[PDB]
Protein backbone atom coordinates (compact mmCIF):
# COMPACT_ATOMS: atom_id res chain seq x y z
CA UNK A 1 0.00 0.00 0.00
CA UNK A 2 1.90 3.43 -1.24
CA UNK A 3 -0.67 4.80 -1.36
CA UNK A 4 -3.58 5.05 1.38
CA UNK A 5 -7.09 3.40 -0.17
CA UNK A 6 -9.56 6.13 0.69
CA UNK A 7 -13.04 5.42 -1.14
CA UNK A 8 -16.36 6.89 -0.86
CA UNK A 9 -17.43 4.38 -4.15
CA UNK A 10 -19.78 1.03 -3.56
CA UNK A 11 -18.09 -2.34 -2.84
CA UNK A 12 -18.43 -3.29 -6.35
CA UNK A 13 -16.01 -0.70 -7.57
CA UNK A 14 -14.02 -1.23 -4.88
CA UNK A 15 -12.15 -3.89 -6.64
CA UNK A 16 -11.40 -1.95 -9.25
CA UNK A 17 -10.24 0.76 -6.99
CA UNK A 18 -7.40 -2.05 -5.74
CA UNK A 19 -6.54 -1.89 -9.73
CA UNK A 20 -6.11 1.68 -9.96
CA UNK A 21 -4.16 1.30 -6.70
CA UNK A 22 -2.39 -1.29 -7.83
CA UNK A 23 -1.11 0.89 -11.05
CA UNK A 24 0.13 3.59 -9.02
CA UNK A 25 1.96 1.83 -6.29
CA UNK A 26 4.29 0.75 -9.59
CA UNK A 27 5.65 4.20 -10.01
CA UNK A 28 8.44 4.72 -7.43
CA UNK A 29 11.83 6.31 -7.78
CA UNK A 30 13.01 4.18 -4.91
CA UNK A 31 16.33 5.41 -4.42
CA UNK A 32 18.01 5.56 -0.87
CA UNK A 33 16.28 3.69 1.61
CA UNK A 34 13.71 5.85 0.56
CA UNK A 35 10.71 5.78 -1.51
CA UNK A 36 8.70 8.95 -3.66
CA UNK A 37 6.36 8.40 -6.06
CA UNK A 38 7.57 8.90 -9.51
CA UNK A 39 5.18 12.01 -11.17
CA UNK A 40 7.36 11.92 -14.65
CA UNK A 41 6.89 8.06 -14.77
CA UNK A 42 3.51 7.68 -13.76
CA UNK A 43 2.41 10.04 -15.74
CA UNK A 44 3.95 9.05 -19.63
CA UNK A 45 2.67 5.92 -18.23
CA UNK A 46 -0.73 7.20 -18.00
CA UNK A 47 -0.30 8.99 -21.40
CA UNK A 48 0.54 6.28 -23.46
CA UNK A 49 -2.27 3.40 -22.08
CA UNK A 50 -4.76 2.27 -24.46
CA UNK A 51 -7.70 1.59 -23.06
CA UNK A 52 -11.40 2.62 -22.01
CA UNK A 53 -11.64 1.17 -18.82
CA UNK A 54 -9.17 3.72 -17.57
CA UNK A 55 -8.59 7.79 -18.80
CA UNK A 56 -6.53 10.53 -17.95
CA UNK A 57 -8.27 13.63 -16.99
CA UNK A 58 -6.16 16.34 -15.27
CA UNK A 59 -3.55 17.34 -13.09
CA UNK A 60 -2.76 20.35 -11.22
CA UNK A 61 -0.39 21.55 -8.60
CA UNK A 62 0.06 24.14 -5.48
CA UNK A 63 2.59 25.55 -3.46
CA UNK A 64 2.31 26.49 0.30
CA UNK A 65 5.37 27.98 0.67
CA UNK A 66 7.04 27.31 4.44
CA UNK A 67 5.58 29.81 6.83
CA UNK A 68 4.92 29.20 11.01
CA UNK A 69 1.34 28.05 10.55
CA UNK A 70 -0.67 25.29 12.39
CA UNK A 71 -1.17 22.03 11.38
CA UNK A 72 -4.44 21.95 10.97
CA UNK A 73 -4.19 24.98 9.67
CA UNK A 74 -2.22 23.72 6.30
CA UNK A 75 -4.32 21.12 6.33
CA UNK A 76 -7.63 22.72 5.69
CA UNK A 77 -5.92 24.55 3.02
CA UNK A 78 -4.58 21.66 1.41
CA UNK A 79 -8.13 20.56 1.53
CA UNK A 80 -9.53 24.09 -0.23
CA UNK A 81 -6.95 23.01 -3.20
CA UNK A 82 -7.93 19.49 -3.67
CA UNK A 83 -11.00 20.54 -3.29
CA UNK A 84 -11.11 23.39 -5.90
CA UNK A 85 -8.29 22.37 -8.04
CA UNK A 86 -11.20 19.01 -8.22
CA UNK A 87 -14.15 20.41 -7.29
CA UNK A 88 -14.33 17.38 -9.91
CA UNK A 89 -14.21 15.10 -6.64
CA UNK A 90 -13.01 16.48 -3.49
CA UNK A 91 -15.31 18.14 -1.28
CA UNK A 92 -16.50 20.10 2.22
CA UNK A 93 -14.48 19.59 5.61
CA UNK A 94 -14.55 16.00 5.19
CA UNK A 95 -11.67 15.41 3.91
CA UNK A 96 -9.42 18.18 5.80
CA UNK A 97 -10.22 15.44 8.98
CA UNK A 98 -9.09 12.48 7.13
CA UNK A 99 -5.66 14.70 6.28
CA UNK A 100 -5.73 15.70 9.86
CA UNK A 101 -5.99 12.35 11.41
CA UNK A 102 -2.82 11.33 9.65
CA UNK A 103 -0.64 14.08 10.66
CA UNK A 104 -2.32 13.80 14.43
CA UNK A 105 -1.45 10.18 14.45
CA UNK A 106 1.32 10.44 12.38
CA UNK A 107 3.92 8.20 15.15
CA UNK A 108 1.89 5.14 14.40
CA UNK A 109 0.90 5.83 10.43
CA UNK A 110 4.82 6.03 9.55
CA UNK A 111 4.61 1.98 10.30
CA UNK A 112 2.68 2.01 6.75
CA UNK A 113 4.63 2.27 3.60
CA UNK A 114 2.96 5.50 2.41
CA UNK A 115 4.74 7.75 4.22
CA UNK A 116 8.42 8.50 3.73
CA UNK A 117 10.24 10.44 6.08
CA UNK A 118 13.80 11.91 5.16
CA UNK A 119 15.71 14.88 7.03
CA UNK A 120 18.26 17.48 5.93
CA UNK A 121 21.96 16.61 6.71
CA UNK A 122 22.52 20.27 7.52
CA UNK A 123 19.66 22.51 7.49
CA UNK A 124 18.55 20.08 10.52
CA UNK A 125 14.45 19.56 9.44
CA UNK A 126 12.13 16.88 7.65
CA UNK A 127 9.62 16.65 5.47
CA UNK A 128 6.82 13.69 4.65
CA UNK A 129 6.52 12.24 1.90
CA UNK A 130 2.61 11.63 1.39
CA UNK A 131 0.61 9.50 -0.87
CA UNK A 132 -3.11 9.32 -0.69
CA UNK A 133 -5.58 7.51 -2.94
CA UNK A 134 -9.22 9.08 -3.09
CA UNK A 135 -11.24 7.37 -5.54
CA UNK A 136 -15.24 8.09 -5.28
CA UNK A 137 -18.20 7.47 -7.29
CA UNK A 138 -19.24 9.02 -10.50
CA UNK A 139 -23.01 8.80 -9.56
CA UNK A 140 -26.00 6.72 -10.17
CA UNK A 141 -25.56 8.41 -13.33
CA UNK A 142 -22.89 6.20 -14.50
CA UNK A 143 -22.68 3.14 -12.04
CA UNK A 144 -20.11 1.40 -13.39
CA UNK A 145 -17.50 4.89 -13.39
CA UNK A 146 -15.85 6.08 -11.02
CA UNK A 147 -13.43 9.12 -9.92
CA UNK A 148 -9.76 8.24 -8.69
CA UNK A 149 -7.81 11.29 -7.90
CA UNK A 150 -3.90 9.62 -6.72
CA UNK A 151 -2.57 13.02 -4.81
CA UNK A 152 0.72 13.00 -3.11
CA UNK A 153 1.87 15.63 -0.17
CA UNK A 154 5.15 16.70 0.80
CA UNK A 155 4.98 18.37 4.27
CA UNK A 156 8.43 20.43 5.11
CA UNK A 157 9.36 21.69 8.50
CA UNK A 158 11.91 22.39 10.89
CA UNK A 159 11.76 19.58 12.79
CA UNK A 160 15.26 16.92 13.06
CA UNK A 161 14.56 13.82 14.69
CA UNK A 162 11.73 11.36 13.25
CA UNK A 163 9.87 11.54 17.00
CA UNK A 164 10.17 14.98 16.23
CA UNK A 165 6.34 14.88 14.92
CA UNK A 166 5.23 12.15 17.05
CA UNK A 167 1.97 13.64 18.43
CA UNK A 168 1.45 16.68 16.43
CA UNK A 169 -1.92 18.35 17.02
CA UNK A 170 -4.65 20.13 15.22
CA UNK A 171 -2.97 23.39 16.95
CA UNK A 172 0.58 22.54 17.24
CA UNK A 173 2.83 25.76 15.28
CA UNK A 174 5.59 24.92 12.64
CA UNK A 175 7.03 25.99 9.74
CA UNK A 176 5.55 24.27 6.98
CA UNK A 177 6.01 24.12 3.43
CA UNK A 178 4.29 21.70 1.22
CA UNK A 179 4.18 20.79 -2.42
CA UNK A 180 1.02 19.80 -3.49
CA UNK A 181 0.02 17.08 -6.78
CA UNK A 182 -2.91 15.35 -7.33
CA UNK A 183 -3.29 13.59 -10.96
CA UNK A 184 -7.03 13.08 -11.23
CA UNK A 185 -8.39 9.46 -13.32
CA UNK A 186 -11.78 8.30 -14.57
CA UNK A 187 -12.44 4.79 -14.08
CA UNK A 188 -14.89 2.07 -15.34
CA UNK A 189 -15.19 -1.40 -13.85
CA UNK A 190 -12.73 -3.90 -14.68
CA UNK A 191 -9.99 -1.53 -14.91
CA UNK A 192 -6.85 -3.93 -14.53
CA UNK A 193 -3.28 -3.33 -14.13
CA UNK A 194 -1.45 -3.65 -17.26
Do not use: C
Request: proline share 4%; glycine share 4%; charged share 20%.
Amino acid sequence: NVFQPVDQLPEDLIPSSIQVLKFSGKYLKLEQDKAYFDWPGFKTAIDNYTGEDLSFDKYDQSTINQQSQEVGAMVDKIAKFLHDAFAAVVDLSKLAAIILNTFTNLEEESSSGFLQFNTNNVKKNSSWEYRVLFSVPFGDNAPSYFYSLVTTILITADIEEKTGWWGLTSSTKKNFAVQIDALELVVKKGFKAP
